[PDB]
Amino acid sequence: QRTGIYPSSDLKVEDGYPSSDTFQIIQTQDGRGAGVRVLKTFARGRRMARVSGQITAFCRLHTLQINAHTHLYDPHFSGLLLHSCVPNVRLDMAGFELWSLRDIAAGEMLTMDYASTEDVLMRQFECHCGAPNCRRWITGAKELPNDIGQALLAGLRAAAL
Amino acid sequence: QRTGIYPSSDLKVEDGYPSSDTFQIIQTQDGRGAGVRVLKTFARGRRMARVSGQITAFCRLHTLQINAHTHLYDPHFSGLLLHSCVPNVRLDMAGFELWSLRDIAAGEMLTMDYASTEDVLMRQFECHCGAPNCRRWITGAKELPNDIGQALLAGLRAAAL
Amino acid sequence: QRTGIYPSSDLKVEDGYPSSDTFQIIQTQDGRGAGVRVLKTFARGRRMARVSGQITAFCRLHTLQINAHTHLYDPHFSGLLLHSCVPNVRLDMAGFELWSLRDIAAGEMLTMDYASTEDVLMRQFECHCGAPNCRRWITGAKELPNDIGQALLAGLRAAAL
Amino acid sequence: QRTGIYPSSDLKVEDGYPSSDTFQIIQTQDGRGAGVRVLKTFARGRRMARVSGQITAFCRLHTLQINAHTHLYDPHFSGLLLHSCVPNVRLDMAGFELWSLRDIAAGEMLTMDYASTEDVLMRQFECHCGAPNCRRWITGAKELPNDIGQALLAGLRAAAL
Ligand SMILES: C[S@@+](CC[C@H](N)C(=O)[O-])C[C@H]1O[C@@H](n2cnc3c(N)ncnc32)[C@H](O)[C@@H]1O
Ligand SMILES: C[S@@+](CC[C@H](N)C(=O)[O-])C[C@H]1O[C@@H](n2cnc3c(N)ncnc32)[C@H](O)[C@@H]1O
Ligand SMILES: C[S@@+](CC[C@H](N)C(=O)[O-])C[C@H]1O[C@@H](n2cnc3c(N)ncnc32)[C@H](O)[C@@H]1O
Ligand SMILES: C[S@@+](CC[C@H](N)C(=O)[O-])C[C@H]1O[C@@H](n2cnc3c(N)ncnc32)[C@H](O)[C@@H]1O
Ligand SMILES: C[S+](C)CC[C@H](N)C(=O)O
Ligand SMILES: C[S+](C)CC[C@H](N)C(=O)O
Ligand SMILES: C[S+](C)CC[C@H](N)C(=O)O
Ligand SMILES: C[S+](C)CC[C@H](N)C(=O)O
């Protein structure tokens, strides 16, 4: 009865896979590209969706890291989750489920800490999450800012005097 | 240049994904249904293929178990690997790779121990692997033979006197 | 030459295990109990320590979650990491390593998001991390605030008008 | 009431950890060194023990592999499990449990396929398991026989004519 974000028929909304009546991909207007938006309210501590995708050996812009050498290619859903330094969802890559870390109001962008699942990103980027504590430049957890990132961080540091 | 077993274009034979010039699905003639056959010779201790599929929460006839609550739906390749009590390949479900446990000659069926990756099967079955040490009735590692399996095993045990 | 936090001789500082010349357990003075303090400066994106402990099946106050059914009992080091809603370290429970999520100055408390590795805590607690965005009441990622937590969160919500 | 193989008090026999009234380490008399022996009968498909040990980054003679980069140091129990090419137990390294793959009679040596959990061994060895289908020379699943192993395997192959 409910229509799923994932195109595969075997992934059913009645089993927890995301529905287009609950999640929507939209183009942000603040330089973050496209991202997942929630259309209903979620209390903190609830499973918002089961997650799926295709196994691949290679890190890509729309993969998530499963373990040391294996990634999950999901350009329909979890790969379109935007980053925030203060995230409102956790993507559990062992149970393959998305959970609310806080109360999320309908219409809010869904955000994970990319460094919470990823050793290294496909690309580093300057962060537009707006949080009071923005790392400003976003990497994997096991990844040093590259020389562009170090230069931008230094200009911000001088400004901090 | 080489054509892949997996229909997805993103899975390339040049990156280790199986090619139809190396693997073939055939119908066995001894009651094992269809299964994967190798068309080239492989020395023991080599990676024969990278493995892929679709993440799902549910055990199915053509899934393999990833971890406690997550399975890999692969009806094109790894889900068509037949069982043997003396296996010639290992399916590594952390690196998602198939490795030869022994020298395999071209034309041989590829066989894993289903109990080496699976807690519980979608279905139990009487084993036709022919090995001198056949469990005769095949389950997951964490799965008791059901009452059919116990009855067949008992008739075999009486015969053993 | 360097003395290790972990009592076991097989865990050597020269292999990355924490040294008492780099980490110290101290009693906080703001209601967080004891916690790990760093004694040297760490740039973001560096491995600060290898982690170890004892495998156990049971969640405890000083365990960390490895996977769905397995935890790591470590009362010497990683179990004494305090929580923060804006963490400065990530505890990678697959590689068993601690990594700096930001620049950390010598003397700073080390903090992880408990919800980033834990489904459920041994106990919930009101948070004293001070971050502008404190969840105020801390649970596992897959754990609803209990009735004490809901009552405290509601009093805070009324105050927010 | 029951005394545990693991020296730690926190690992209780009442929670499934092995008891010396069920398991015993003995010196084999056929060139396999010491190994774990079972003292009670176990039907196939039962959990014989919970497993534990110390996390370490390094492969050792008495470690078992957890994931790509992490091993479990257990010289009291699971590291003393001998190898067999036709194993009677599976060591589940995700749930950290030992399960019977077949009916095991009291007094039998417990045997796993080392290649079922290990990419690479600390050392390769000629196999004395006696199975009709012995690989004769034992490696990790992702490990080629070294030049000693290749030489011994070739002498056996000539004998096979
Ligand atoms: C695979 S994407 C997620 C979807 C992507 N925005 C898209 O439009 O297809 C990851 C990329 O999104 C952008 N992005 C995500 N979070 C961001 C943030 N907080 N600030 C700026 N850019 C962000 C970055 O360009 C990053 O490399
Ligand atoms: C998903 S299948 C593998 C592919 C399957 N044969 C097919 O034809 O689609 C697993 C099933 O194959 C059959 N099978 C596999 N190995 C077998 C064996 N050694 N002896 C008998 N049947 C076997 C069993 O019916 C088992 O439930
Ligand atoms: C196992 S402990 C870490 C070490 C512990 N403080 C100790 O003193 O042994 C986890 C507990 O520390 C306390 N704690 C950790 N982070 C905290 C925080 N940010 N605010 C308040 N209490 C915290 C809580 O009581 C929580 O249950
Ligand atoms: C860590 S051990 C297990 C305990 C060891 N036997 C001990 O005595 O401490 C692994 C080693 O045991 C021996 N071993 C285990 N299984 C064997 C087998 N089936 N045949 C010959 N040697 C074996 C090998 O020397 C191998 O390197
Ligand atoms: C949520 S996915 C966009 C994050 C990881 C991805 N491999 C990236 O590089 O951004
Ligand atoms: C190699 S797959 C056929 C084995 C596991 C599968 N879920 C089954 O039930 O047979
Ligand atoms: C960093 S450990 C203190 C967090 C998880 C632990 N099991 C707890 O309950 O707090
Ligand atoms: C059961 S443990 C003895 C097997 C793996 C170990 N690291 C070895 O090298 O034999």
Author numbering:
A (entry chain A), B (entry chain A), C (entry chain A), D (entry chain A): 11 to 171
Kindly provide excerpts from the paper associated with this entry:
BurB, a SET (Suppressor of variegation, Enhancer of zeste and Trithorax) domain-containing enzyme identified from Burkholderia thailandensis, initiates DMSP synthesis by methylating methionine (Met) to S-methyl-methionine (SMM), with S-adenosyl methionine (SAM) as a methyl donor. BurB is a S-adenosyl methionine (SAM)-dependent Met S-methyltransferase containing a SET (Suppressor of variegation, Enhancer of zeste and Trithorax) domain, and belongs to the class V of the methyltransferase superfamilies. The SET domain proteins are well known for their roles in methylating histone lysines in eukaryotes, and BurB represents a new member of the SET domain proteins. Each BurB monomer consists of eight β-sheets and four α-helices.
The crystals of BurB-SMM-SAM complex belong to the I222 space group, and there is only one BurB molecule in an asymmetric unit. In the BurB-SMM-SAM complex, the SMM molecule is located in the same position as Met in the BurB-Met complex. In addition to the SMM molecule, the SAM molecule was also clearly observed in the BurB-SMM-SAM complex structure. Residues His93 and His138 form hydrogen bonds with the SAM adenine ring. The side chain of Arg133 interacts with the ribose ring. The amino and carboxyl groups of SAM contact with residues Arg42, Ala44, and His72 via hydrogen bonds. In the BurB-Met complex, the Met molecule is accessible to the surface, suggesting that BurB possesses an open conformation. After the SAM molecule enters into the substrate-binding pocket, the loop (Gln37-Ala44) generates a conformational change and participates in binding SAM via the residues Arg42 and Ala44. Structural analysis of the BurB-SMM-SAM complex indicated that either residue Tyr124 or Ser88, which are located between the SMM molecule and the SAM molecule, may act as the catalytic residue. After SAM enters the substrate binding pocket, BurB generates a conformational change to form the closed conformation, which brings the sulfur atom of Met in close proximity to the SAM methyl group and allows the nucleophilic attack on the methyl group.
